[model samples]
Target chain A: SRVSTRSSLAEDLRAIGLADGDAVLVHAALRKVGKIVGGPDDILDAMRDVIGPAGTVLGYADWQLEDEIRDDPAMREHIPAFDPLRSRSIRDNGFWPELIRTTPGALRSASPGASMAAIGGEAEWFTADHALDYGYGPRSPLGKLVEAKGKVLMLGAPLDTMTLLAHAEHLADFPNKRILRYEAPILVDGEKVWRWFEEFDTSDPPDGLADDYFAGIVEEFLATGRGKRGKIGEASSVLVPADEIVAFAVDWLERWGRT
Target chain B: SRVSTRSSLAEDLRAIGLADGDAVLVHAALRKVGKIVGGPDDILDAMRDVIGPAGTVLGYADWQLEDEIRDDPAMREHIPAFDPLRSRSIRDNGFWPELIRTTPGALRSASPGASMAAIGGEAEWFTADHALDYGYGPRSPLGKLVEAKGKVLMLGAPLDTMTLLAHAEHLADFPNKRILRYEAPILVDGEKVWRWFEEFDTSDPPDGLADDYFAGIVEEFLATGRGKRGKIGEASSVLVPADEIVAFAVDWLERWGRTA
Candidate 1:
């Protein structure tokens, strides 16, 4: 079927064995879910029901509108200045912070004080203090995750489009020399700020192909018993194996974290 | 300052003016000129002196070494089998035919006639027969200049490296769809031999980036008007003005030759 109801979607996740405390990176087509037997609200409810109390779901809503420029004068002219449609907001309807506050267990990292938030662009408030280093610095969501040995689940995106690689590019640490630190910007309470962050060198990664790099962790998940399987909407999901998770996290940290 | 020359080299065709011909393509190294002030033979001499007798002189030599596959035994084992270097009795050293004979030129198109002489690589014999087509067809060197629009000059050795735009990966006429034609090899003196040849469609190019797309033309030259200039040995040479040339040729043929 082109679309599935929220209850059915939750059932699919249950079928995959989603359990508490699992960390999931989700890529979703919101409008697609809204058209299913259950609407957007129902789909969200179903997902929450299956994930239970301990699981963490993180995703990119900003990437959906990457084509929009942040500096458009029309967007910058208003008091709050950012256009809802043109701007990248973590919220479902321009109230992302309130959405997280009301969602019980759900949180958008790009939101304020979220453990791993992406500053700048829409969540500029969190990056105000480190404005200069925000886009390419450790404070960025991807940056912090890399330092923390985060596992990224690529939903519908191609490997070439992975923004995580941007860390290496901005650090100027590949096919050349190693860069250890750089300054960037952050946003806090609607004001712009700046900060300095550290980065690790990953110039000579062992694997050349994108798929192979992620496979090590995938294999580990298969070997370990803690791996959870789940579904988003209709897509199949697997809880990453612990060993694979550790490998990915370690690789990311060793390559992109502070020495 | 615009021109420089070394002492050890002999002037083969220095008197001829390079800009006068229809279009000339050349291939040679600056070091070939020996200890002369200009490292390689002065290209100005060949264009002005030797080639002035007939048409323009063109060159097509860029030293691109495939570093990645340099040590691969497969490449080495297979490359010599074709022996494009020894079979074609080209001029100068292997450098010329290996480099210039590949550029699309007048002789590249002439029917397999006795008058056809190639100086580098297997010039007289290297037509697009059994060649892989990337797209641009009849417009290829041998195809476009079928009537001998210009001459090619080879300044170096006889290695299999030919520089014809039509043969390279960049030209629009490359990866042609048509079948090529060649004369059947017969006993020149008494030896049994076979020659390669064919003929086919010269239209309908492919969809993606042609192999020579990047090398044939670039945007840098039109902005500077100096042509794509680069250093060969100690002398500075103007590479093909690929972008400008394409623009001019396309418009010229459409406007003047369409009905003719």
Candidate 2:
């Protein structure tokens, strides 16, 4: 197996057009990046170095715990609060994504429906003001990441599910946004209290309203050379400006279908 | 030498009207309560002991950090975040307020403009949904406490500044609420993020629109014998149903130039 240390990962990242003031949202398949020598912690430090002091890093952290409790009729009584320190992500997101989540200066959006984590100077702006609207769309961290002149760096991750910028474009591309209401917990003083979290629905509709329907679009996106491709520790990687990607996807999806 | 021990405070509390399952909103003046044996911590424990596990105790944790920072031109950039676990009170509400705020299993409302801290069984329910629209009213901890059939117990505190039920009543008693916005901090993944906390202005309208109006109402309401009053550690205290107090205050406040 090929091995890559933190310094090597940083070198690969810098080569792929990462620069100062780039608020980057990263989705990583760390195992595919080869044996990271110093592991996730090392990778975290290296990314911070790449982003610089003015830059920021982001990751999607969807807490899939809603399914386990949604069915019980007595559920609204209370919930296991979404303590930023305690909430976990879906298992498939890889090991390194949490490095940014757990970093000292990290900030995470509180929308339990579609939460995200971030670190650096811009982390607060990106994570703050998380509207209940389709969490990936305008005013959300996904949309604001694009507004921040950020880039999405997919490291051996699926272009469909992991790259959220595409899902954001789906907001503008499609008609008939879905209505959603659910509950999540926040601390009062220090007590856990759950309340109805309301928002416009995202592509992955909660109760099976519509299929994701993004596979073909991603296939065409990668095939059309829309992003900057590079190598990282034996794994294929791509870096694209969040706006350019969203712009391209919006136009392409509108050609496919738009609201 | 007036020495108020935890046992004496508990004795005084039981004498006042607090009981099991009685959700009580507390506003205290520590110095007025005389010399506490173990001070604020002891009184906090006594309150817990009086209510037991079935009951809850809440404190007003309103952050008054606005005045200090609003004058600074660069203050809009970022603030230190409204961290419930670490933030201090406005210094006037007494030191014991933070005991409930920082205690183990204590919960704080999200609004820095009108924050509250609670402890015990209904702590979660009381502090669950804090609305920016009169956070003291219908959906807030004050509202939920009434929904839970709770009580408000004043421990040697002023009726004017200490009691919040009056303001909560203002939402229903009057119209044309003032609109206001302020910034407060919340911890996101443990990092501080300052965001705009919007609300239907909770402040007294300047130029004497209200004039700490609760004082006269409380003074009269207490005379009406709606609540129980007793000696508490060398200070006066009142214990009344949260709803009854609000109902009486609402109608009375309606008479006190209601539309103002």
Candidate 3:
């Protein structure tokens, strides 16, 4: 319980319902997890170990590396194309996404607006077609993760900021939600061209909503005793199955997300 | 119709009621206007001639150049600072904005999501505080133009795509409008950094309405016997009072852009 080594962290992860072959999406705030023998590298390796060879470990790394200025003719000429290999996450997105995106064999989604990096079984499956339309609907990585019957592990990251799957489910279910178009920049034949991103609006609350809400969605759904919870290091974490959560969100929000 | 020289195009703009000392927001499809003597450069010069030194001519630029890769990790690190003076617009936005952006004394707004380049009276006024909040609401350039009591000029550009004032009115008035946040990469202390752009959801029609409604907003208001229509060379153009249109939009959309 005291020593946060590869084995000790692996014990914590496994005890928290991280099973072999589970396609898992992990969100964390490492500073809250307390000091460890190793940094995030050790913690993630332990997570990968619990998932084993057949499981996938996913992390969120939404970057601002697109041609946001391409709409302006005078300013659009100077920018370089997006490379999945080198750009860093927003300084505030924390350590895991930057760590996973740089890791060997890690695959990241092409969509710049909502990017996710993955490793292990179906790593490619979850990250593909992130911008395939409908914003965060079933076409997104989070949606596909639900279809994969995946599990989400929030390791010390606050529910409001760290829950990645809930955005997809919430936006799709939002009655007041509207689509927003982004001229996200990506590479095409070594040229950085503006790729249009048309998806549901991510900045606003649902109809008649008053604030940024995520834990509320999780709280409402988990009200029926569906997910598991435990601790790793000093940080309390929650482990929830993707399928059940997304289903509950769609049904509940569509039914009463208003008012 | 034959020669689109600077003077002739200037004549066309004046005929369409472009007056000196008017703060103008112009949207044009130049190629459709037919053989210009000096291409878009001449057309823009003629527009400037119409607005003159006392007036202002504004064009929408909206470029996020510093890191079109603002959303990428490795690529975002490699990109340098944002340069407002040199970036280009989208190809389909046509030739005149590119022409006007490069012209002397043009001030482009700092916000990449919804930028406007202006010259002459209150050039800074139109482009100032562009990203202080939403893309087209009370804080945006489009909204500011109305505050200045400017005019809207549509020269061969479609109403839905070209009208500059409707976005703010629709978003502010509609019951179901939404806002999206952007980590807008802009210049601060000469280094490229991200600024937040909270703007109306431009991806869908306001209030769950059907496809492309700005033109409809214009048509509905213009039906009440307002604005002037005339010919500019081969192109049909409309010039409208900015304040009246925006006011009508806010009242009309708010009155009717409801879900129930």
Leading candidate by TM-score = 2
Ranking by lDDT: 3, 2, 1
For model 2 the local lDDT of residue A62 reads 66
* Candidate 2: Cα lDDT at B51: 91
Tell me how far the alpha carbon of residue B143 in candidate 3 is from the true structure, in angstroms, after superposition: 2.2
| Tens digits of lDDT, candidate 2, B123-176 | 887777787545666778877777887888777887776456544555545555
Candidate 3 stretches with Cα past 4 Å from truth are A1-259, B64-70, B79-81
lDDT, model 1, position B47? 42
Chain B only: TM-score of model 1:
0.30
Q: Each prediction's Cα lDDT score? A: 0.36, 0.68, 0.69
Model 3 interface Cα RMSD in Å: 18.7
- What's the DockQ of model 3? 0.01
What are the per-residue Cα lDDT tens digits for candidate 1 across A4-57?
655666776556654444444443444433234323434444545665644444
Give fnat for candidate 1: 0.00
Chain A TM-score values, per prediction: 0.48, 0.84, 0.89
The DockQ-derived docking category for candidate 1 is incorrect
Q: Which residue ranges in model 1 land beyond 4 Å of their true spot?
A: A21-23, A29-35, A53-55, A61-185, A194-233, A241-243, A248-259, B1-260
lDDT of 3 at B43: 66
lDDT of candidate 1 over B1-260, digit per residue (tens): 22333211113333222334334555455444343321122344334344443444433321221323324443332111112211222333334433233222323322222112233323333233413232223434433333344433333322122233333223233333345443332233444344444434222223343443323233332344644443433333344433345444344323332342
For candidate 2, list the clashing residue pairs, or say none: A188-B107, A188-B108, A189-B106, A189-B107, A189-B108, A190-B106, A190-B107, A191-B106, A191-B107, B82-B185
Instruction: Assess every candidate by TM-score.
Output: 0.30, 0.48, 0.48
Better of 1 and 2 by lDDT: 2
